[model samples]
Target chain A: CPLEKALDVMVSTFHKYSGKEGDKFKLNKSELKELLTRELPSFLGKRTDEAAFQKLMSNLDSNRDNEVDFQEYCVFLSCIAMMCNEFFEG
Target chain B: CPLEKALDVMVSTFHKYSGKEGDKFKLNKSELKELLTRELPSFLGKRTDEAAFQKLMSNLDSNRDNEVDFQEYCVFLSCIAMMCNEFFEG
Candidate 1:
């Protein structure tokens, strides 16, 4: 069940960072920053500036709640996967 | 980088099974079944009956084109991840 394991990894990874601050089920700006910096360093790279991070947060916080819920996190991961798919396909 | 690797795994895994036949960029019912049965045996298990699979196929084929595209596949994975999240959160 490798695919299931991948799904589990995604779920666990979200919780790993989301639970570290307010709203245990959501990711605040700081938690999101930590997640991108630590777990997805390659994707963010040197572009982890305050402005860029704020832009990303604004884009991901679809409900304008100033936090990322599980649905938003999944959407973000899916976009990353789509980008990778395009890179490999090209 | 772990999360990036996970995203890569999801992208690669889709292509690994998706390119087996038809359209090259989409998953037909047979390919979907094979993917679930092989890569996600635990998820399918003894419930992989023909009727159940057809239902799943219908559900995953979001656009009603009778095929599961990359976006549809990602959404499916996201739903699975959400279920897992609920399980862990509970």
Candidate 2:
């Protein structure tokens, strides 16, 4: 059940970060920033400036609600998977 | 970077199953079936009859090409994450 473990990681990781601040069901900019920088340092690179990070937040906040819910987070993960797949295929 | 590791798991797991048969870049029905049965027994349950599996396959094959590509697979994983999130939140 390794794949199931991946799903578990996705859920637990979200909660691990999402519960740190306001709106426990959502990830504010700081929480999202921390999640990305700490958990996805390889994919996101080491130095994410304010402008770039803000742009990422803007892109991910599809509902324009100023925070990322689980759905948006899932979409982001899917996009990352697509990118990785392309790289692997290429 | 546990999350990055999860992303790696997603990518590697897809390749692991997708390479077992035809269309190395995609998962045909049998590949998908084996993946669900072995890797996702908990999510898919112990016994999935043909009708139920076919229905699940139909839902997962979003492009209607009769196969599940990485993007579709990612979306499926995302949906699973959402389901898990809902249960956790509830």
Candidate 3:
């Protein structure tokens, strides 16, 4: 339930950040992965592979610049949040 | 410190499950990858690629079944947990 709610918040937030079309946001796959790895080292880690990064890109990068727009970014954030919620809850 | 604490718990728990040899909890890299992808769809979606999975497998799968045994699983879980804590903390 928390994951769902968080996803909702993330998606909504993304929409809010990006324009209605979400064209304003910009970050390539490599950039996003790098950002996550840098910011969330304990979680995402530098050990992650290209495949993993690519996988993340595929799921969240709706615009498909091999990148993530606001919506995609939200989904990624929500996903991470959801996972943490489950771990803490469990 | 939270990440360190959580990692400690995870590694210990893993060793506990895998036993002294830590060989009992065998699974290939593909298997672990599949499990996370399936289990944590929201965070670890399908977009994750071979390279990403391989990287995880290499990092966690110390036994190199191309998989993570109980200990490796613990590490992965710890990483995820650690990430979530930071997100929420921030």
Assess every candidate by TM-score. 0.91, 0.90, 0.34
What is the lDDT for A4 in model 3? 28
TM (chain A) per model: 0.90, 0.90, 0.57
Which residues of candidate 3, in runs, are more than 4 Å off?
A1-90, B1-24, B63-65, B88-90
Which numbered prediction scores highest in DockQ against the true structure? 2
**Residue pairs that clash (backbone atoms under 3 angstroms), model 1:** none
lDDT of 1 by residue, B1-90 (tens): 557667777888888888989888899998888888888776664665888889889988979998999999999888888877764531
Q: Residue-wise lDDT of candidate 3 within A1-90, one digit each (tens)?
A: 232233233333333334433244556654565456544476754547888678766877666566565545534544553455343722
Model 1 residue B39 CA deviation (Å) reads 0.8
Task: Provide the lowest-lDDT 10-residue window in model 2 chain A.
Answer: A81-90
lDDT of 3 by residue, B4-73 (tens): 2332333333333344332445555545554555445667645578886676568876765554655445
Instruction: Write the residue-wise lDDT of candidate 2 on B1-90 in tens digits.
Output: 668888889888998999889899899999999888888887665557888799889999988999999889888888788878764621
Q: Could you list the chain B TM-scores for each candidate?
A: 0.89, 0.89, 0.57
**What tier of docking accuracy does candidate 2 attain?**
high
Over A1-90, each residue of candidate 2 has an lDDT whose tens digit, in order, gives: 667888889889988888999999889999999998788887765557888788889999999999998888988888888778774631
Backbone clashes in candidate 3 total 9
Using lDDT, give the best candidate's number. 2
Weakest ten-residue segment in model 3 chain B by summed lDDT = B1-10
Q: Give the C-alpha interface root-mean-square deviation per candidate.
A: 1.3, 1.0, 11.4
Candidate 1 residue spans exceeding 4 A from truth: A88-90, B88-90
